[PDB]
Design a protein around this ligand. Structure first.
Ligand code: K
Length: 135
């Protein structure tokens, strides 16, 4: 069936993270914003309403929300307030998310492994990995 919904929906709390500072620095985030965001350990709520997928991130620091349809490009406003154009597709069961803006691109993969949800964000060379568990 759509096994995609079952795989992704629910509430995910961050449990580990590597290279995030470096990833943000590369994406262009200011030093103070990088630091506070580095400590924020946000939740990622994923939901599905028919064809429309929704991903929220809530911390005390900052909240964000995207709603989208796979393959359909949409305007997104990132946590650091980049005005970007996003496209999220489903590849092998992985959610691939591309952000284009000002000639730059960054790719965010979200993939289920075991009971975990692994997010890999790649900008130019720099790769960051975050791991989430169901809350
Ligand atoms: K927090």
């Amino acid at each position: 069936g759509s096994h995609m919904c079952d795989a992704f929906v629910g509430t995910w709390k961050l449990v580990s993270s590597e290279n995030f500072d470096d990833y943000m620095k590369e994406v262009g985030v200011g030093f103070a914003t990088r630091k506070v965001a580095g400590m924020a350990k946000p939740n990622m709520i994923i939901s599905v309403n028919g064809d429309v997928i929704t991903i929220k991130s809530e911390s005390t620091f900052k909240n964000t929300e995207i709603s989208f349809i796979l393959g359909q490009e949409f305007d997104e406003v990132t946590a650091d307030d980049r005005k970007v154009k996003s496209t999220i597709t489903l590849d092998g069961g992985v959610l691939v998310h591309v952000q284009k803006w000002d000639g730059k691109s960054t790719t965010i993969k979200r993939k289920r492994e075991d009971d975990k949800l692994v997010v890999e964000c790649v900008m130019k060379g720099v790769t960051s990995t975050r791991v989430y568990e169901r809350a």
